[PDB]
Curated annotation (Swiss-Prot):
One of its GO terms (molecular function) is structural constituent of ribosome. The lineage of its organism: Bacteria, Thermotogati, Deinococcota, Deinococci, Thermales. It comes from the Bacteria. Coiled coil: none annotated. Belongs to the bacterial ribosomal protein bL28 family. It comes from Thermus thermophilus (strain ATCC 27634 / DSM 579 / HB8). Keywords: Ribonucleoprotein, Ribosomal protein. The keyword Ribosomal protein applies. One of its GO terms (biological process) is translation. This is Large ribosomal subunit protein bL28. Signal peptide: none annotated. It holds the Pfam family Ribosomal_L28.
Length: 93
RNA sequence: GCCCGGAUAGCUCAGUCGGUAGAGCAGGGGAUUGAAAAUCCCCGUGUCCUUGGUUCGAUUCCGAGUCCGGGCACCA
RNA sequence: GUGAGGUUUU
RNA sequence: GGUAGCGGGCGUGGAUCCCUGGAUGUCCGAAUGGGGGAACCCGGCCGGCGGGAACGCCGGUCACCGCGCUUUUGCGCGGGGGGAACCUGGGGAACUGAAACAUCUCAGUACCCAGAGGAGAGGAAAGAGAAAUCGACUCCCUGAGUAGCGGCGAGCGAAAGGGGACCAGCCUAAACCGUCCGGCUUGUCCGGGCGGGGUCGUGGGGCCCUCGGACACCGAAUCCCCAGCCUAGCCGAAGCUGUUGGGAAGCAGCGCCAGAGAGGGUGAAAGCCCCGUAGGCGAAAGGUGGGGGGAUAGGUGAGGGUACCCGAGUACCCCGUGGUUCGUGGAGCCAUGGGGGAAUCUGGGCGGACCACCGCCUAAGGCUAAGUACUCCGGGUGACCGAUAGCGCACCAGUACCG
RNA sequence: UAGGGAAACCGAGUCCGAACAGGGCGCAAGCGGGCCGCACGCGGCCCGCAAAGUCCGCGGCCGUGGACCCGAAACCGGGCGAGCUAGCCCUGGCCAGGGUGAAGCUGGGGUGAGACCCAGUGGAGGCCCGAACCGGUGGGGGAUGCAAACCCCUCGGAUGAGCUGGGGCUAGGAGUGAAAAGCUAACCGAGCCCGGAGAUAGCUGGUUCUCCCCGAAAUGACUUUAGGGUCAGCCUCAGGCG
RNA sequence: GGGGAUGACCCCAGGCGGUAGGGGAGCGUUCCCGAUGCCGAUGAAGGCCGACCCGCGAGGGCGGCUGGAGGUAAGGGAAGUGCGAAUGCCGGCAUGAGUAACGAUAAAGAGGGUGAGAAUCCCUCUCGCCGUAAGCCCAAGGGUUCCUACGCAAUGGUCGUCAGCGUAGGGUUAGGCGGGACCUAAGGUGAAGCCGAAAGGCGUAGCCGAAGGGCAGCCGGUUAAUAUUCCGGCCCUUCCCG
RNA sequence: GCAAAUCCGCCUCCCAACAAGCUCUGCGUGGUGGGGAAGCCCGUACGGGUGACAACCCCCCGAAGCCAGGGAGCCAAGAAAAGCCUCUAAGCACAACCUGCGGGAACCCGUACCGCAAACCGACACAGGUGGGCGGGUGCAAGAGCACUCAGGCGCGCGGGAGAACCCUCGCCAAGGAACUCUGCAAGUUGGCCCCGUAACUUCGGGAGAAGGGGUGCUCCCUGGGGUGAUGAGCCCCGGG
RNA sequence: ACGCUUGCCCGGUGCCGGAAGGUCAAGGGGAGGGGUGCAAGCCCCGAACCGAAGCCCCGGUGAACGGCGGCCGUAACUAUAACGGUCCUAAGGUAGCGAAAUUCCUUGUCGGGUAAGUUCCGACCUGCACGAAAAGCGUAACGACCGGAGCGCUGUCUCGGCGAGGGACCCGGUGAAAUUGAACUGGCCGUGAAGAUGCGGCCUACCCGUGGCAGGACGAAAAGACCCCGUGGAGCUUUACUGCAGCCUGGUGUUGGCUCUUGGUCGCGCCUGCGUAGGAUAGGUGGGAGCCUGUAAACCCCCGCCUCCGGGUGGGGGGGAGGCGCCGGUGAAAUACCACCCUGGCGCGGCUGGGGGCCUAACCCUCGGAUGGGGGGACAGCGCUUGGCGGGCAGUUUGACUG
RNA sequence: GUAGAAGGGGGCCUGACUGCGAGGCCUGCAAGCCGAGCAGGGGCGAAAGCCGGGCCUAGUGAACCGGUGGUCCCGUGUGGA
């Protein structure tokens, strides 16, 4: 799925397996022996954030783990202790 | 094709961690046992892989591989 | 407290 | 109404018909009070009716999601679904071609999903590429089947520049400043929304000093008005006689008009029998108004000092990938799935491994008309057809019929 | 209109090369030609629209496009179907009649007590015979039939591993399967409908008016190739030699 | 090759079987320039003939009959341009041929009536068949096929006056019967929540979901067609009001 | 009882205890109402008057149906929720609930016909298939089987001649009895009930209805009973001589 | 189902276990080189070494896949095998059956059944080519299964006949079907693509029908259902190829705090060499007549240090001119003065590489009413990357000449 | 085919060269083979002359992708790689 902050999507990518040592390191070269479609995913991980309303769980990538904890200090001057444990979620940017 | 361990007597094998070497068969007669089997005894078969070198030497150590194998590639 | 690779019938 | 037939009534006091604005518009259908096997059933609240408490009906409101206000209640603004073809993004084949065939081609095509449009996408250079050059973007013709890629086989295939259609450029965060709120050490600072301040490569901009003068100019893509166009239409020249025949428009005589001798109908073959073509008028009302006049928002300058800021897990490196002609080749650039990981103009990216010089441009935020594709629909044309043609249907057709 | 060379680069020359040896590429060779300018080297001229090429038309052929037409077995994408059939879940219904007589119970015999035996009672079985019912073993008819799976007789189970009504779930490289590769809407070694797709076919068939002139071949050299191909041989047309 | 009046008209010599093919010359059809024209009721295209004329031909002229309103030179062009074959297609009509069959071997016969027409329609008297149905009542399913009156255009495997066939008019009456305003199982949808590129897929509470549970009606008559509904007797249920 | 209870569950019980009381069904009787034939006249059809003041009594067989949530046995262990009964939370106790007495209201859809076929599904008025219930009587021991026949329908929607070969179905046959054929394939015999008898072998059940046989009709007399009815008179059943 | 058993061998393969050892990926590490720049710097390689899974190797596993022999001589001729010698050997089939659903020779041989038996039954074993859980031999009951025999009875037959109904036949009514080049369609003998109604010769035959047979029209149906070809298409298999699902595994993110001993380029330091032939704690060698020495020697008493148990080398606190080697002695080599690195027990400079023990907040599971308890615990799962297994799946290929 | 050496023996050398190659055999094409002669510089022989492998016919493999030396030709703005 999509990240909650950045938005990195699971992209498709070919898995081009081949056989043969290369040109400058060998004799002939690299011949492609088979191609197949492939489904690359991101590091979608869960993290708990202790806000005084509710301990919210997120879904964020490993390259954006410090974006969440950096985003707590940005999300500290906003309205704390909201009237429901769900409205704290979508009000991050 | 780099690397890995070796080629010993018709047969296969006792080996060195550098100063050693072969035992068994289709074989002839043989103390034996009161003239019976062969327990046991002489006995027919070493370029110890081809070759170069520390070395008193090479029947044994080390270097390239011609001899055969497993993994590893690479083959337009 | 100790002894047999062990035998065959003319 | 097609559309006959019986039986009735309307119209100059303007009937029928056409166009525009309205009202009603049962039920289903995004369906949306709820259920539901679509065109059915059952309700809640507020008013009314039937003698009306119990029963029924009518008129409003009651689905979900994202926003602003409302501290919760609730009120306003949008979205859901469909659309012949087109466009963008995310997935995505196989037969065929290589006279097999797995890389490749077919092809990022058919097809599936999402949203928007009368187009979409793209767009104001971290561009292009050799000339110190061009200067947003889109489309056509060239360049050119060229350079290139490719079991270097099949085959795929640019870009630069030029001639053209069109031409519009902008907005915002950052440094600095004012209010309010949040954490709280209520210190002298942090975090967020608003108001001024900035949109740059000739580097721009914040603060301070000097030159000052704008109170003059530009100007929308926003708004207002209007020319014009569309949804109904109107005016609009000119001929008779006799004969064959059932029928004259033919034929014979004398004529007429032409800004109209296109077409169709008229018992047959007509410029002068009719409807209209030439040409000119026509809007009360509703749409368009890219065309043209006005208004506003918004823009306007030079030197010195300071080096505070110029788009963060981002540039860059490695592995795995897609696109450009680039299939891993010397493999650049554009985005990145993962790992490491800064700087803010003495900072960076690019000019095809790479190093130095020399040139171009500021990425990591967003918007943008015009030129381009297509025809459900409107009309005109056709060396287009004429009921086995043409769309599947010229006819009461996506019907009868099959499943 | 200038071409060589892989390019650099050079140019009526270039390249191979030390080279003017030698060779491969092009080059100039003269068509209409009063050209007598009066030097028979004639320089080049009236001058055929040409050596010399381009643009358009009309034909033959070819490549990419479906490319003379018809016809597959198949592949992929999106969906429709478990009202037939296969399995299963929930809820109901069906099984006439007759017999054999298990476990237990009661009574009697037995001994010290049982175990054990007999009689009655008892009515369970994937029991037996046999109806509706679900099936089709064997025979006959039916064979453009009554029927795109029947009819007459005989049959196996018929209290169950049973039969069946109603509401559902499972699906195409998948479902289900007491397992045959059966069934999945009358045809299943991978359904049906649409689209790619006018797929491909060196494989069959067909290919429409007339007249005239010439006229073949079934051979050779090669191909994961022998029924098809490329070149040559054979034929025809046009332009030149004679 | 020649006379070369260049004659595109006649002499001389040679040749004229032919598939796949190569080449040359013509005919016919749709439309277009010619066409603001010409032909055409004294008769156009098309249809049926010709023993007529021209042409080696595809064919073109002319004459007669039918037809009732279009056709188009000469010279050219563009083709959706010439059919007998493709187990081609579409529509018609043949052969098979007055042939097989006429649909369970349960079975018909006779007298009257209607009617133009009767083995087939209506009535009566005999005979046969089913009678755990070939009888009756419901749920499926079908959707006016039910009844009456008038008829045989078409249908009934023959006829038919009849018809489940056509035209018209009627006919289905519910507090108590079966469903909803009651509930639930398998299963489906689905607040919260979870997962997945999107379409979407799981999923608590709750909702839907039945031939399952609960709930108050029995007997007889009436029409050509309605009956636990209409009516006669008789008994109950739910809710509201005093 | 994811408790709030006087309700339910558990433990202490003076008692009752195979019972009785109280509630829930079915049947009979029951105020009363309806039906009332076969046969006969009028009969076009349809059917109508009828024959009555109609009778409407008794006996037996007897269900898979009702009481029902009965009883016994067995393992494979045999749904949910709603109505209704009861106790309470917030609330209300001038309310609200229950039983009577009188008066009102009861809504939307189905309703015809065929429904084991001519109207459903099979291109057809198709010898196929289609769920549930009633599905009579007599005899065969019984029975939804067989044969016939009540009520109800039907003669199957092409017939009439002759009575060739040949096809299908059926019946019969001197003598042989499987000799035909790949094979007793097909056809035929045995067949139901009661009574004697029943082998090899075995997992002791079975084989087994083994194989083999005898009887079955009708009339009269005597007699054992059982059920209902009353103890038997009457009526059904099992028999024996 | 059940009675008796599952005997032989682990060589190939599958599987399990393996802290010894070989190979190997990403990666870590990096001597030594290359390009460029005036250099500072930047960019490429890079051999040593470390580095899992997997493969190789060892053992086990046969109610795992899988198989289970030949040859020469010997007993009163024959026969043997029960005995003696070989192995492509891992191993040579044991019990129990056997011309059998197995047997080619074969109808093997004998006996029963019949008069006649290629079938059947019971044995013989000469098992091409039974066989022990792809189970071996029997077995009460049972089977719409197959094979054989007998019995009473039957047309099934020798050998047919007769009768009945529904068709067939005639008449009245309705009235198709596939096939079809046109047909005015004779036989024989020859020819013709090699099987003649049509061609040639001879013979026969008036035209047209009705009922029947099916010998012909190479009759009809289906574009052979057998065989071959197509570089046709599918289903299935495998140690045929390549990928994928899935599984194992190193690195890395999620993912942390500590501790123990081990590892690598690692020589600053410790003091390690005795098969040894003589005097031996004798390393190969380099100087080898000087220095241990009065800044505290010698028979051996200090003594940490290691040890093959002999013994030597450092702190030397009390000694007091004596230790004795270059040669002789050993030999493949001569020290005692200055150390060149191997052989090693060992302190540490660079990174901790791996293996354990504890806590745990991340993460996961779980508990009635869950911002809180319990357990696992930085492991699992998940992403990227690397290597291996992998017909479970998919795309595929498997040639041609050929009397 | 060869003794009027190509056969056997001895001396000296590597022409078992580099750039070409007129004219041909054969062939569909691709290939295969003979090659007098020119230049440079050699070997043998005093010279004339011969030597561009083997007495001859078989002893092999088109193309593409790459490896090792030289050439310094191109090398993507410039100089280099
Ligand atoms: Mg990171
Ligand atoms: Mg003795
Ligand atoms: Mg009108
Ligand atoms: Mg009128
Ligand atoms: Mg009127
Ligand atoms: Mg009027
Ligand atoms: Mg008006
Ligand atoms: Mg309107
Ligand atoms: Mg309304
Ligand atoms: Mg609704
Ligand atoms: Mg809905
Ligand atoms: Mg109100
Ligand atoms: Mg009111
Ligand atoms: Mg009122
Ligand atoms: Mg809206
Ligand atoms: Mg498109
Ligand atoms: Mg895309
Ligand atoms: Mg493909
Ligand atoms: Mg291909
Ligand atoms: Mg492409
Ligand atoms: Mg939309
Ligand atoms: Mg849309
Ligand atoms: Mg536009
Ligand atoms: Mg646009
Ligand atoms: Mg846009
Ligand atoms: Mg845009
Ligand atoms: Mg910009
Ligand atoms: Mg351009
Ligand atoms: Mg321009
Ligand atoms: Mg501003
Ligand atoms: Mg007018
Ligand atoms: Mg006018
Ligand atoms: Mg007139
Ligand atoms: Mg006119
Ligand atoms: Mg006139
Ligand atoms: Mg507007
Ligand atoms: Mg405009
Ligand atoms: Mg700064
Ligand atoms: Mg690339
Ligand atoms: Mg990039
Ligand atoms: Mg990234
Ligand atoms: Mg960069
Ligand atoms: Mg660069
Ligand atoms: Mg249109
Ligand atoms: Mg049409
Ligand atoms: Mg017509
Ligand atoms: Mg339909
Ligand atoms: Mg030349
Ligand atoms: Mg020239
Ligand atoms: Mg089913
Ligand atoms: Mg159903
Ligand atoms: Mg049974
Ligand atoms: Mg029944
Ligand atoms: Mg069956
Ligand atoms: Mg059958
Ligand atoms: Mg059978
Ligand atoms: Mg039976
Ligand atoms: Mg039975
Ligand atoms: Mg069934
Ligand atoms: Mg599919
Ligand atoms: Mg599968
Ligand atoms: Mg399955
Ligand atoms: Mg089927
Ligand atoms: Mg199929
Ligand atoms: Mg096709
Ligand atoms: Mg295609
Ligand atoms: Mg071809
Ligand atoms: Mg000729
Ligand atoms: Mg040719
Ligand atoms: Mg010529
Ligand atoms: Mg003449
Ligand atoms: Mg002549
Ligand atoms: Mg000719
Ligand atoms: Mg020809
Ligand atoms: Mg036409
Ligand atoms: Mg005229
Ligand atoms: Mg006329
Ligand atoms: Mg015409
Ligand atoms: Mg006429
Ligand atoms: Mg055509
Ligand atoms: Mg035709
Ligand atoms: Mg035909
Ligand atoms: Mg006849
Ligand atoms: Mg006949
Ligand atoms: Mg006939
Ligand atoms: Mg007949
Ligand atoms: Mg009959
Ligand atoms: Mg009669
Ligand atoms: Mg009569
Ligand atoms: Mg009469
Ligand atoms: Mg009759
Ligand atoms: Mg119905
Ligand atoms: Mg119907
Ligand atoms: Mg009707
Ligand atoms: Mg009538
Ligand atoms: Mg009629
Ligand atoms: Mg009729
Ligand atoms: Mg009449
Ligand atoms: Mg009717
Ligand atoms: Mg409901
Ligand atoms: Mg209601
Ligand atoms: Mg419900
Ligand atoms: Mg409920
Ligand atoms: Mg559900
Ligand atoms: Mg769902
Ligand atoms: Mg119900
Ligand atoms: Mg019910
Ligand atoms: Mg409950
Ligand atoms: Mg009814
Ligand atoms: Mg009725
Ligand atoms: Mg029934
Ligand atoms: Mg029917
Ligand atoms: Mg019928
Ligand atoms: Mg029927
Ligand atoms: Mg049935
Ligand atoms: Mg009797
Ligand atoms: Mg009886
Ligand atoms: Mg019966
Ligand atoms: Mg009767
Ligand atoms: Mg009848
Ligand atoms: Mg009849
Ligand atoms: Mg009939
Ligand atoms: Mg007869
Ligand atoms: Mg007889
Ligand atoms: Mg007899
Ligand atoms: Mg016989
Ligand atoms: Mg015989
Ligand atoms: Mg039989
Ligand atoms: Mg009784
Ligand atoms: Mg410099
Ligand atoms: Mg340097
Ligand atoms: Mg540096
Ligand atoms: Mg059975
Ligand atoms: Mg017979
Ligand atoms: Mg019949
Ligand atoms: Mg007839
Ligand atoms: Mg013949
Ligand atoms: Mg003839
Ligand atoms: Mg003849
Ligand atoms: Mg026949
Ligand atoms: Mg722990
Ligand atoms: Mg925690
Ligand atoms: Mg813990
Ligand atoms: Mg981990
Ligand atoms: Mg496969
Ligand atoms: Mg393929
Ligand atoms: Mg000589
Ligand atoms: Mg050549
Ligand atoms: Mg030689
Ligand atoms: Mg560059
Ligand atoms: Mg450069």
């Amino acid at each position: 799925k999509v990240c909650e902050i950045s938005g990195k999507r699971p992209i498709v990518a070919n898995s081009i397996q081949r056989r043969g040592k290369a040109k400058r390191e060998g004799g002939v070269g690299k011949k492609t022996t088979g191609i197949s479609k492939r489904r690359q995913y991101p590091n979608l991980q869960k993290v708990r954030v202790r806000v005084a309303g509710q301990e919210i769980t997120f879904r964020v990538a490993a390259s954006h783990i410090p974006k969440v904890y950096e985003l707590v200090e940005r999300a500290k001057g906003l309205k704390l202790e909201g009237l429901s444990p769900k409205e704290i979620k979508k009000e991050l940017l």
